[PDB]
Amino acid sequence: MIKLSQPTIPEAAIERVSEILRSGQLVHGEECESFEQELASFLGVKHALVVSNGTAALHLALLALDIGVGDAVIVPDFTFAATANIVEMTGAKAIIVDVDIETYNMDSELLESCIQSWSGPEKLKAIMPVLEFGNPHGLKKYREIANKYNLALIEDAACALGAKEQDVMVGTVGDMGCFSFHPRKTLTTGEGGALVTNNDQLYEKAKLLRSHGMMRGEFGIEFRCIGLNYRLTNFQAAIGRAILPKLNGWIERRRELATIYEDALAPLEQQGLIRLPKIVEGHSVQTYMIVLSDQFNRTEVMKALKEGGIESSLGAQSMSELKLFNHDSNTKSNYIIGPKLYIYGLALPLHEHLNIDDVNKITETLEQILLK
């Protein structure tokens, strides 16, 4: 069976996890601190905070910017539900903007006009674009637009650790940036995430919120404010630390698999039967999602692929189609691209233990299905 995802925990990491469990040094320790340092250096960013999961990173980002009831945050239509959900878990309203058919990322023009026509009643406080599947495209434009309208930028870089927007690493352009280490993401810690920022106050506040308002004082730990628990275990941090130095190389290889997919599938694209993703420079290829033409029923294609020993799945959700984000601004609107990607987007296997021969099998199976 060719799998969509096959999480890769280096044997070194496995042995280190065993040492930690045996010695009983379990809670956020030197291991988390080191991971944070190592992430910050990898990204070229001032501060990193590792946390329970990528949702927790987005949540702490929101809480650190004091976003909640009476506020609004713009999210993309195409993403995982967590993006829009976590905004509304704070009491703010998720304001949906459609994505671009080429990049699967928030459409920068539709973003700008959404801000221009914003009529309240909530105060628009932030933009939360997704660098979907590892695609950096649009990030500098989001920064530009955010600054123009005096809004915070929160990068939902869940899928995009090690993605690069030209000269600048994804996650380091927003006021804060958020990563997931969920098993389908390329670096995993089972569950895990990271919140990053070049801003000291945002860092210090999120750090308080991550662990019950705790900080080191003159005579030990002081409780400075109300907070949560979104700490990551020491042994989860160790897993992360062992993968990070391999991550760039993993991404290079994934870009090579993408090339092989592009090779095999370009005729089908040219025949108007599918659309391929544009793997720009700096795309980390967390997911390789094609778009089936309307002619094809994705559920049937998936079943046929499965019979031929190939896993596949939808890429992400349409936030408008979920019917959970009920601000007037969303219901009065018609989304085009996200709902389309939701129904016809197809993720194909792409990971660390896929080779040319596998991709060839995948591509031949898809071809026969689509040309029947």
Which of 339, 350, 333 shows the shortest CA–CA distance to 294?
Answer: 339
Residues 313-352 that bind its own copies (CB under 8 A): 317, 322, 324
* Partner whose binding site includes residue 27, from Na ion, its own copies, none (CB under 5 to 8 Å by kind): its own copies
Of 55, 284, 320, 329, which lies in the binding site for its own copies, with binding defined by CB under 8 A? 55
Helix (H) or strand (E) holding 33: helix 30-43
Q: Quick check: 231 and 51 in contact, CB under 8 A? A: yes
- Does 13 interact with its own copies (rule: CB under 8 A)? yes
Of 125-133, 145-153, 301-309, 331-339, the window that binds Na ion (rule: CB under 5 A) is 331-339
User: What does the buried/exposed string (b/e) look like for 154-187 if buried means 16 or more CB atoms within 10 Å of the residue's CB?
Assistant: bbbbbbbbbbbbeebbbbbbbbbbbbbbbebbbb
* Partner whose binding site includes residue 327, from its own copies, Na ion, none (CB under 5 to 8 Å by kind): none
Residue 76 or 277: the one with the smaller Cβ distance to Na ion is 76
Amino acid in the structure at residue 182: H
The answer to whether 22 is a known ligand-binding residue is yes
Q: Quick check: 29 and 183 in contact, CB under 8 A? A: no
- Does 22 interact with Na ion (rule: CB under 5 A)? yes
Of 35, 40, 47, 59, which lies in the binding site for its own copies, with binding defined by CB under 8 A? 59
Helix (H) or strand (E) holding 193: strand 193-197
Helix (H) or strand (E) holding 194: strand 193-197
Number of residues that bind its own copies (CB under 8 A): 58
Angle among Cα 195, 184, 294 to the nearest 5 degrees reads 115
Of 56, 97, 130, 196, which lies in the binding site for its own copies, with binding defined by CB under 8 A? 56
Strands 47-51 and 193-197, by their bridges, are antiparallel
* Partner whose binding site includes residue 195, from Na ion, its own copies, none (CB under 5 to 8 Å by kind): none
Interface with its own copies (CB under 8 A):
5-9, 11, 13-14, 17-18, 21-22, 24, 26-27, 52-56, 59, 69, 80-82, 84-86, 88-89, 91, 182-183, 188, 190-191, 212-214, 219, 223, 225-236, 239, 299, 317, 322, 324
Question: Binding site, residues?
Answer: 22
